[PDB]
RNA sequence: CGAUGUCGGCUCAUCACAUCCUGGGGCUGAAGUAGGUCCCAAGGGUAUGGCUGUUCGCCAUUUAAAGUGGUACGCGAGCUGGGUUUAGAACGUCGUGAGACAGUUCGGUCCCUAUCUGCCGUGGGCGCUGGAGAACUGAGGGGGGCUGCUCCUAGUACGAGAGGACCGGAGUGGACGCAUCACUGGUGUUCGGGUUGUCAUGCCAAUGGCACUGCCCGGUAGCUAAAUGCGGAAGAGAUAAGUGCUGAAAGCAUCUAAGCACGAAACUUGCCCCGAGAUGAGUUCUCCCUGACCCUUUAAGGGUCCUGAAGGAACGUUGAAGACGACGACGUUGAUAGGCCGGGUGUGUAAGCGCAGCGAUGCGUUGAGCUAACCGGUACUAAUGAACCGUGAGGCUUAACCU
RNA sequence: AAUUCCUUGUCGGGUAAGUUCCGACCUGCACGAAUGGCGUAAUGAUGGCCAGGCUGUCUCCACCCGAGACUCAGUGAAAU
RNA sequence: ACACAGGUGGUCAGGUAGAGAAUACCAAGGCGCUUGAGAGAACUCGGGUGAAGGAACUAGGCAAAAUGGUGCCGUAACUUC
RNA sequence: AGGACCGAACCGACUAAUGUUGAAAAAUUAGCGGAUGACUUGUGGCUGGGGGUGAAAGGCCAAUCAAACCGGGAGAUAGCU
């Protein structure tokens, strides 16, 4: 019925969906932006903006829990450290999605998903 | 009397001193107000309009914005009908809040059923699961046989098949009214009504006690 | 949920250690038993000087659920064990002299004070 | 949600003591016979706590002198009138179910002492 | 699961009258190239709204 | 016979009335209760099991009753394959033999993506004639219609006694259907925890992967039944069988011929649902549009420029809506969704450190940390301004009031 | 009885209820002694039958996780 | 018949746990199987879990479920011992 | 010691489901039987159509068997369609 439940499924296991998004976070917190579908990118900010908003503050256990899921240390040194610090007063959604054309090989209606650091 | 219109809005229980539980049905019924009476003398009938509700100043469109002005009430979220028991006529722009119900015993709901999609036969009219073992292949869950051979030549204008059900409009009958809070316009109804908690309720009277 | 093929406990000395309900009495087409509706049993198991014996078609009223029993506030009253108290067919008295294994208070129907007066607990 | 919440803090009875599952609590209920109004106790374990709001609901067990007896209780139902905690457990479970199969002295359980 | 006759050229042609596909009959014009894209989309140059979003 | 798969079971049924029950009556060798029998009646209901391949039947225990038949002895492009008529084997019997037997026994591949009709749901197009947005009327269809027990009446009527009412009323259940998660439970591979093996993050300490979610214990939302509410009806109209009144034909008599009144779960409504494609295309309310030039077989004509409203659609954020369309809310004059903050809820005392002990580990910090869909707020991210479609007062004849 | 048509023979046991099953009585349609007769420890992806355990086989299904089905893009059959 | 879930003899065959070449997780090395992307209906197939009852299913306990390892204690009728 | 026992390789194929215009002109998945022998298997030979071989089914003899396949009698014959 559906009713009430939310999380896609991407006509993938819930063991492929977990690794799936544990690297296609980790691609957005080593390029800041990145190009897939749509129903990807509305998960992925499901992932990241949760993951951002425990990077807020810097704690040894809050580090743990940054590695725990998304077992990278790189891209916890990348929180913490960068992406820590340059969110601190933006108050909520930390990324931006940005729908474009289609893949060609699929007709796939993509989208860019960037964190909302263009402006240097 | 006529009946009115409310939004439900979750359930609960209620204590009763004696130590028995209530399942009670808490239903927002706001200050109805009435944009259109009618009489046989222009409609054939006789009944009122009402509506409820407070819409945005973009979203009222011309003709209905039209309508609330003759009225001359805010613009609600819905309209509805409601007949006329013969000796009730109200005015146009006549506000009613909740208390026709503070003398009714037994009210009856009608609203949208919750939607459930396109529903099996075992789901949507009981049919019993065959065997699922001994021999069975491919059909558990199938209706079987769908009528006889040759002489009927043809299924029967209406045979329990699978469709949609849900998402249509019912009305279940004969509840008791627990308790009318005027004051918070609120209306406590015993057991369970149909719809989501949200999607709008036709109380009304009950006609068949 | 006491339906047919259940096989039970009995709760009194009557002889019977073990009981099977063999269908429910009251309704047509009934499916199950509840709390004091009474049933058909048969002797499975028996002591050797009761009352009755393997084999024996009398009746009985449940008395403990592993269902359970709702009391009129949500407050349900789950037992541990299916049990039953064995009957006398045409008179339907019950046939035992002390009942063990406490009852439930919906029993009190004016034909089953004999079996609230002789439970020990509720 | 504030309809709700109105409605149910309103019936809510506030004096129930803070207990949890392992304290062998002590419950006096309103039983009737529809004339007489008495009080008797009900002595067990606290096996699951359920609370939510008015409707939160707590079972706890007596091993009976038959067997063992289980009920759940309308925390916040006039029927139940004081629920005095008797002991207080200690165990590392929220809900206590597993001792729907232990008995006699495997369903023996510590105490805090803090 | 077999055809009993065989449909005509009529019968085909009149079940494809719903597969005709549908224009877009509007493409958004962009403030500041000027391009046409569409609604909610980035430009093919890149833009979108007013900003080089694709920093390409 | 260039093929119609022969029994029974499962499932799903539908019709007939020669009716098993409930309902309405006459007669009774009908006191009462309970029965016998015939007439009217098909609205609804019309067993679970042991043995058998069996339908059937016998038996056990219930029920208000566990109806009789048609529908390829309904239903294999829906499912079983036990029986029966494939190839193997054996026993009894028959025959010299190969083999044979409505004699028997053990074992034996049951195919098909649905064009059309039909049926269950759901949209597109056009019509409805000026267009659009809403609310209804209602022709005509469908769903629903079962019923026990106990008590009061009264243990009165009736009856030697034992027993033991109709009618009327109330309450409580069984079966079935509708609806709903507040409770009682189930699931809950998106939440927490425990733990075996092993690999890895360089190691210890902590974590992640894989082994059916590795195996298990609990659990939010949603869904859901075993859970919780509700439903059948009352009443009205016209009738069947039947009971009658008045009453002639036939001085009487008679329910019928004129006339009138009672009379069932069947019929028509009353209850709920679909419903103006009801082409007989309805009604009401409201909103919007009242600009100029040419040709002309000069006609409800064709074309251009100037304007294109109300509204719809499109795209987008999605929804307790949903196969896809569709339907509902919202589109910054913003709460539609994600995130965030607080709360609730769930799991149970995280990590690190300190301390006690050789150690596993315990205690304190701390009922902490982590918390998915849930509840209330907050524009931080995304719903961009425009554009596209749809037009410019709506034919003729006639009549009624005005002019 | 792999044999008994009549037949579910009749008695007893198992069962609330047993056309199958086990033990017997002989009225053996139509058992019978190497086309072997009667028993037999063990063995059997052997036949029949019963009890315990155990469970969604079932009472009666409910939910969840994946692969198709559904939608869009590419390619593109078949019996008939 | 095909870039077909099939068939094809012999040899080498590590680490941890384990009785083992079983089985599980890894090394070396080799691959993700030549259609994909969304939605999360009925229904079908491969599976998980389940309140009370427990074969009431059916031709039949078919299929599932379940038992399952190493030591030690202990083990009947019958028997060709 | 054993035509011994449990159990992989290997051989075999009892049950169920899927499949049955399939991935396959008899396979796959989850369980099963044997698994030191009357075993299995590689290689090369030998037995041939009224013949071969057969722990015997009238099974097997190149996806064909109560008498293979190929060519030739032969355009056999057909009171049948
Ligand atoms: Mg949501
Ligand atoms: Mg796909
Ligand atoms: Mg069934
Ligand atoms: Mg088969
Ligand atoms: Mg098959
Ligand atoms: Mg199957
Ligand atoms: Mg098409
Ligand atoms: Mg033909
Ligand atoms: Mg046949
Ligand atoms: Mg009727
Ligand atoms: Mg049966
Ligand atoms: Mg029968
Ligand atoms: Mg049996
Ligand atoms: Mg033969
Ligand atoms: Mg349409
Ligand atoms: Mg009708
Ligand atoms: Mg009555
Ligand atoms: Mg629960
Ligand atoms: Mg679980
Ligand atoms: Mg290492
Ligand atoms: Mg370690
Ligand atoms: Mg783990
Ligand atoms: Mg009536
Ligand atoms: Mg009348
Ligand atoms: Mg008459
Ligand atoms: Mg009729
Ligand atoms: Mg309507
Ligand atoms: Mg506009
Ligand atoms: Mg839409
Ligand atoms: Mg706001
Ligand atoms: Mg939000
Ligand atoms: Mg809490
Ligand atoms: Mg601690
Ligand atoms: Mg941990
Ligand atoms: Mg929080
Ligand atoms: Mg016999
Ligand atoms: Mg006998
Ligand atoms: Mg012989
Ligand atoms: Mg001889
Ligand atoms: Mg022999
Ligand atoms: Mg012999
Ligand atoms: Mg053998
Ligand atoms: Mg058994
Ligand atoms: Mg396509
Ligand atoms: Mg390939
Ligand atoms: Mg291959
Ligand atoms: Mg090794
Ligand atoms: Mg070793
Ligand atoms: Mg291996
Ligand atoms: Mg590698
Ligand atoms: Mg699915
Ligand atoms: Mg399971
Ligand atoms: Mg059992
Ligand atoms: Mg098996
Ligand atoms: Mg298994
Ligand atoms: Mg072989
Ligand atoms: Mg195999
Ligand atoms: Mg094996
Ligand atoms: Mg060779
Ligand atoms: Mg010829
Ligand atoms: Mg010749």
Redesign the interface.
Same mark, same amino acid.
């Given at each position: 019925m559906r009713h009430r439940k939310s999380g896609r499924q991407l006509n993938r296991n819930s063991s492929h969906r977990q690794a799936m998004f544990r690297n296609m976070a980790g691609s957005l917190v080593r390029h800041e932006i990145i190009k897939t579908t749509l129903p990807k990118a509305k998960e992925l900010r499901r992932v990241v903006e949760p993951l951002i908003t425990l990077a807020k503050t810097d704690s040894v256990a809050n580090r743990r829990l940054a590695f725990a899921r998304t077992r990278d240390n790189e891209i916890v040194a990348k929180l913490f450290n960068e992406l820590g610090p340059r969110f601190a007063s933006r108050a909520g959604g930390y990324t931006r999605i940005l729908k474009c054309g289609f893949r060609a090989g699929d007709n796939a209606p993509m989208a860019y998903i960037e964190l909302v650091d263009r402006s240097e | 009397m006529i009946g009115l219109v409310g939004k439900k809005? +979750?359930m609960? &229980?209620?204590?009763? #001193?004696? +130590?028995?539980?209530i399942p009670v049905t808490?239903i #927002?019924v706001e200050a109805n107000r009435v944009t259109q009476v009618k009489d046989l003398a222009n409609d054939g009938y006789r009944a009122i309009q009402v509506t409820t509700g407070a819409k945005k100043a973009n979203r009222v469109t011309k003709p209905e914005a039209g309508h609330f002005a003759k009225a001359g009430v805010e613009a609600g979220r819905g309209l509805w009908e409601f007949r006329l028991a013969e000796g009730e006529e109200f005015t146009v722009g006549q506000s009613i809040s909740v208390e026709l119900f503070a003398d009714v015993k037994k009210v009856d709901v009608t609203g949208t059923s919750?939607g459930? +999609?396109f529903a099996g036969t075992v789901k949507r009219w009981n049919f019993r699961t065959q065997d699922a073992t001994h021999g069975n292949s491919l059909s558990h869950r199938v209706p079987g046989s769908i009528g006889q051979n040759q002489t009927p030549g043809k299924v029967f204008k209406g045979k329990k098949m699978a469709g949609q059900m849900g998402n249509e409009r019912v009305t279940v009958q004969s509840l008791d009214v627990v308790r009318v809070d005027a004051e &918070?316009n609120?209306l406590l109804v015993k057991g369970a009504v149909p719809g989501a908690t949200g999607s709008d309720l036709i109380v009304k009277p009950a006609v068949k006690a | 949920m006491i339906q047919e093929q259940t096989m039970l406990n009995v709760a009194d000395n009557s002889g019977a250690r073990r009981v099977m309900c063999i269908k429910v009495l009251g309704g047509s087409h009934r499916r199950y038993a509840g709390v004091g509706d009474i049933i058909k049993i048969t002797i499975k198991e028996a002591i050797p000087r009761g009352k009755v014996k393997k084999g024996d078609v009398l009746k009985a009223v449940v008395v403990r659920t592993k269902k359970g029993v709702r009391r009129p506030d949500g407050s349900v009253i789950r037992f541990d064990g299916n049990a039953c108290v064995l009957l006398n067919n045409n008179s339907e008295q019950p046939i035992g002299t002390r009942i063990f294994g406490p009852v439930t208070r919906e029993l009190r129907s004016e034909k089953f004070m004999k079996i609230i007066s002789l439970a020990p607990e509720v | 949600s504030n309809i709700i919440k109105q409605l149910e803090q309103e019936q809510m009875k506030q004096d129930v003591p803070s207990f949890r599952p392992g304290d062998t609590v002590e419950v006096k209920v309103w039983v009737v016979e529809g004339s007489k109004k008495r009080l008797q106790a009900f002595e067990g374990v606290v096996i699951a706590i359920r609370n939510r709001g008015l409707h939160s609901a707590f079972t706890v067990r007596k091993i009976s002198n038959g067997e063992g007896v289980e009920r759940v209780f309308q925390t916040h139902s006039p029927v139940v009138d004081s629920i005095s905690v008797k002991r207080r457990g200690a165990v590392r479970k929220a809900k206590l179910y597993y001792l729907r199969e232990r008995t006699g002295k495997a369903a023996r359980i510590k105490e805090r002492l803090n | 699961a077999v055809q009993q006759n065989k449909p005509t050229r009529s019968k085909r042609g009149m079940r494809r009258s719903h597969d005709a596909l549908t224009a877009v009959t509007s493409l958004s014009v962009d403030k500041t190239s000027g391009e046409k894209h569409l609604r909610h989309h980035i430009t093919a140059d890149g833009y979108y709204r007013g900003r080089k979003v694709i920093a390409k």
């Amino acid at each position: 019925m559906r009713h009430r439940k939310s999380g896609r499924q991407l006509n993938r296991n819930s063991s492929h969906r977990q690794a799936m998004f544990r690297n296609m976070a980790g691609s957005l917190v080593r390029h800041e932006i990145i190009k897939t579908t749509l129903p990807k990118a509305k998960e992925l900010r499901r992932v990241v903006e949760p993951l951002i908003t425990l990077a807020k503050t810097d704690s040894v256990a809050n580090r743990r829990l940054a590695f725990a899921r998304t077992r990278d240390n790189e891209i916890v040194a990348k929180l913490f450290n960068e992406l820590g610090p340059r969110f601190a007063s933006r108050a909520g959604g930390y990324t931006r999605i940005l729908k474009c054309g289609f893949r060609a090989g699929d007709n796939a209606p993509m989208a860019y998903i960037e964190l909302v650091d263009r402006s240097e | 009397m006529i009946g009115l219109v409310g939004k439900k809005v +979750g359930m609960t &229980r209620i204590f009763t #001193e004696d +130590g028995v539980s209530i399942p009670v049905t808490v239903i #927002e019924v706001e200050a109805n107000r009435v944009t259109q009476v009618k009489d046989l003398a222009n409609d054939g009938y006789r009944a009122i309009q009402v509506t409820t509700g407070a819409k945005k100043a973009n979203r009222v469109t011309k003709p209905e914005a039209g309508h609330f002005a003759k009225a001359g009430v805010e613009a609600g979220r819905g309209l509805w009908e409601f007949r006329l028991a013969e000796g009730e006529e109200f005015t146009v722009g006549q506000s009613i809040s909740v208390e026709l119900f503070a003398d009714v015993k037994k009210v009856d709901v009608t609203g949208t059923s919750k939607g459930k +999609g396109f529903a099996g036969t075992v789901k949507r009219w009981n049919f019993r699961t065959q065997d699922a073992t001994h021999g069975n292949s491919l059909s558990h869950r199938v209706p079987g046989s769908i009528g006889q051979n040759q002489t009927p030549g043809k299924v029967f204008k209406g045979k329990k098949m699978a469709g949609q059900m849900g998402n249509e409009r019912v009305t279940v009958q004969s509840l008791d009214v627990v308790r009318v809070d005027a004051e &918070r316009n609120l209306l406590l109804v015993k057991g369970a009504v149909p719809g989501a908690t949200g999607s709008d309720l036709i109380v009304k009277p009950a006609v068949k006690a | 949920m006491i339906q047919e093929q259940t096989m039970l406990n009995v709760a009194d000395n009557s002889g019977a250690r073990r009981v099977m309900c063999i269908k429910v009495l009251g309704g047509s087409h009934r499916r199950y038993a509840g709390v004091g509706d009474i049933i058909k049993i048969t002797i499975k198991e028996a002591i050797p000087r009761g009352k009755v014996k393997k084999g024996d078609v009398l009746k009985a009223v449940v008395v403990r659920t592993k269902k359970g029993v709702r009391r009129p506030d949500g407050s349900v009253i789950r037992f541990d064990g299916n049990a039953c108290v064995l009957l006398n067919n045409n008179s339907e008295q019950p046939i035992g002299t002390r009942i063990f294994g406490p009852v439930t208070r919906e029993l009190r129907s004016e034909k089953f004070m004999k079996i609230i007066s002789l439970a020990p607990e509720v | 949600s504030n309809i709700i919440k109105q409605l149910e803090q309103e019936q809510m009875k506030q004096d129930v003591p803070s207990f949890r599952p392992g304290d062998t609590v002590e419950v006096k209920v309103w039983v009737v016979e529809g004339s007489k109004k008495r009080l008797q106790a009900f002595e067990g374990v606290v096996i699951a706590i359920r609370n939510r709001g008015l409707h939160s609901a707590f079972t706890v067990r007596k091993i009976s002198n038959g067997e063992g007896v289980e009920r759940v209780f309308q925390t916040h139902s006039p029927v139940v009138d004081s629920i005095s905690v008797k002991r207080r457990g200690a165990v590392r479970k929220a809900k206590l179910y597993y001792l729907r199969e232990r008995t006699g002295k495997a369903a023996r359980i510590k105490e805090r002492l803090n | 699961a077999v055809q009993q006759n065989k449909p005509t050229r009529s019968k085909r042609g009149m079940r494809r009258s719903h597969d005709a596909l549908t224009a877009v009959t509007s493409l958004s014009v962009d403030k500041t190239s000027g391009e046409k894209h569409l609604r909610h989309h980035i430009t093919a140059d890149g833009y979108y709204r007013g900003r080089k979003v694709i920093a390409k």
